[PDB]
Design a protein around this ligand. Structure first.
Ligand SMILES: *[C@@H]1O[C@H](CO)[C@@H](O[C@@H]2O[C@H](CO)[C@@H](O)[C@H](O)[C@H]2NC(C)=O)[C@H](O)[C@H]1NC(C)=O
Lengths: 223, 103, 218
């Protein structure tokens, strides 16, 4: 997160920290708990083995509030497009149900085809980098505004407003950044978006997957 | 070299960069050629962003930039088949930033 | 060297290994008791002061007290352009001078201007990769080559082991190309990969830098 603030510890108890390992390399991503047994995240965060940490604030410390669970199944959307980063949504079926408590509990999803007006204030949270030079051990968050689609459509030629959300003001140094992928766009306490992509510079606007456009696939996959 | 170096890398294609934080494994305390590393970069371009060899061929530009531990940078043109005949240490690579523009 | 042969022990006492963290990354040529000469790209992204110049080596896997070892004081280059691979040469001053003897002798360079042409028979050598994923060579290798003037660019000396798949490979960069007794070449780059039998290996033209060379070692 660029231009944000350290989270109040455990104030966002749906947050999931993802450590992804494959023979050729690793990745770190965010995600969010949507049922006691499923985490939603970005499909470009997929890999051979996925460790999920719930209940964390400092991911560099083995805090006793943390629950470590492996992804039994990592289900990328079947039409995920790696070239353009479209349909960028993945469900993780966890190996065990989480123990729900104050530090671990799911977040609500939007209603079908729910929309978001430009100007809506949302919060995004994650453990990603805060600049080119520095990272964070603890959870950070920033408030961002939903934009009119035209702000993204010219910069990101493959942007599709039917399946994605355009977020962030171009003149601000406030954004999600590297390592924040898969974390939620929270508007009015509902997860409307998933952090997906933007510019190498981290300058806004940036693109989020529009959760409401995938609710049937979500529901079908979880049952 | 059983343990591996984890070198941060970024991929931008057509002005789009995914916001994961990713690392490429290289054998620790190993020597490598620009052919080896270039081929690893090509494999990564394909498996992470679906970028094919033909796409690198027809791209306006296709490069990757190695930031070495000394602070020096080398820019490698992926469209080229010329390789310097030297070897370099895997522990000397601090960062790799890959950028493809089909403009 | 791919498709080559083990050099006779101390056959070429002007040959040099450049090591770093114990690693032969490039070859080089004793051009003066206090000066070696290599390829500029061999040192453009490394800490020189860690580099060790090893003279009188034969089997790098073995300790050989015969070996002399030095460290670089100063580098001297002449416009290595990496983008287009022009002027791929460097001369390096050691932290002393070598004891010229049975295992260590200064090489001999061609005349400024001398060019050479299609069909000359030269020898390449080095400790680069042996090719069949056999790994890097500990015993110095050598390879009969023929100068080709083909896809070769105007600004290089290019070579081919025509008739079979052999050539220079990685770690052979900087090593000499000896033609009629004279170090005419510095390994600079390969095309597509090693021992293509399609593209010649490209060497930097030692004979094009003779001028500057003398200007630094006299
Ligand atoms: C490969 O190169 C070596 C070294 O130059 C050749 O061995 C030389 O043979 C020539 C005769 O052509 C003699 O002038 C020298 O006495 C030999 N030199 C050494 C160092 O032994 C060898 O004949 C070459 N082979 C080919 C096919 O060119």
């Amino acid at each position: 997160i660029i231009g944000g603030r350290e989270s109040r510890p455990h104030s966002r108890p749906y947050m999931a920290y993802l450590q992804i390992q494959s023979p050729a390399g690793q990745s770190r991503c965010g995600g969010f708990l949507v049922r006691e047994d499923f985490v939603l995240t970005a499909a470009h965060c997929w890999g051979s083995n996925i460790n999920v940490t719930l209940g964390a604030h400092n991911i560099q410390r083995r805090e006793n509030t943390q629950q470590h669970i492996t992804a039994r199944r990592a289900i990328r959307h079947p039409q995920y497009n790696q070239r353009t980063i479209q349909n960028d949504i993945m469900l993780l079926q966890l190996s065990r149900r989480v123990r729900r408590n104050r530090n671990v509990n799911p977040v609500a999803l939007p209603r079908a085809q729910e929309g978001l007006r430009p100007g809506t204030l949302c919060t995004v949270a994650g453990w990603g980098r805060v600049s080119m030079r520095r990272g964070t051990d603890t959870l950070r968050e920033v408030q961002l505004r939903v934009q009119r689609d035209r702000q993204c459509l010219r910069i990101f030629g493959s942007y599709d407003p039917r399946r994605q959300i355009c977020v962030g003001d171009r003149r601000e140094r406030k954004a999600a950044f590297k390592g924040d992928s898969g974390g939620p766009l929270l508007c009015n306490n509902v997860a409307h978006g998933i952090v997906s992509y933007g510019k190498s510079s981290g300058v806004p606007p940036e693109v989020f997957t529009r959760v409401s456009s995938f609710l049937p696939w979500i529901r079908t996959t979880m049952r | 070299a059983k343990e591996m170096q984890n070198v941060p890398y970024t991929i931008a294609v057509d002005g789009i960069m995914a916001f994961n934080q990713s690392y490429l494994n290289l054998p620790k305390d190993s020597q490598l050629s620009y052919l080896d590393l270039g081929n690893k970069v090509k494999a990564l371009l394909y498996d992470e962003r679906g970028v094919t060899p033909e796409k690198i061929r027809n791209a306006k530009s296709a490069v990757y930039t190695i930031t070495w531990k000394d602070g020096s940078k080398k820019e490698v043109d992926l469209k080229k088949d010329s390789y310097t005949a030297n070897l370099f240490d895997s522990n000397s690579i601090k960062q790799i930033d890959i950028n493809v523009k089909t403009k | 060297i791919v498709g080559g042969r083990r050099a006779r022990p101390h056959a070429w006492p002007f040959m040099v290994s450049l090591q770093l963290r114990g690693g032969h990354f490039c070859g080089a040529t004793l051009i003066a008791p206090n000066f070696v000469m290599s390829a500029a790209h061999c040192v453009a992204n490394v800490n020189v002061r860690a580099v060790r110049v090893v003279l009188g080596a034969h089997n790098l896997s073995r300790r050989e007290p015969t070996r002399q070892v030095f460290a670089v004081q100063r580098i001297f280059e002449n416009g290595y352009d990496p983008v287009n691979l022009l002027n791929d040469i460097v001369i390096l001053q050691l932290n002393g001078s070598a004891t010229i003897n049975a295992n260590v002798q200064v090489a001999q360079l061609p005349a400024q201007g001398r060019r050479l042409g299609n069909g000359v028979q030269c020898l390449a050598m080095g400790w680069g990769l042996l090719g069949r994923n056999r790994g890097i060579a500990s015993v110095l290798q050598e390879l009969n080559v023929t100068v080709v003037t083909s896809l070769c660019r105007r600004s290089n000396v290019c070579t081919l082991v025509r008739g079979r798949q052999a050539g220079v490979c990685f770690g052979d960069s900087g090593s000499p190309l000896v033609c009629n007794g004279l170090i005419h070449g510095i390994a600079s780059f390969v095309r597509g990969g090693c021992a293509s039998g399609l593209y010649p290996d490209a060497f930097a033209p030692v004979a094009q830098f003779v001028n500057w060379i003398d200007s630094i070692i006299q």
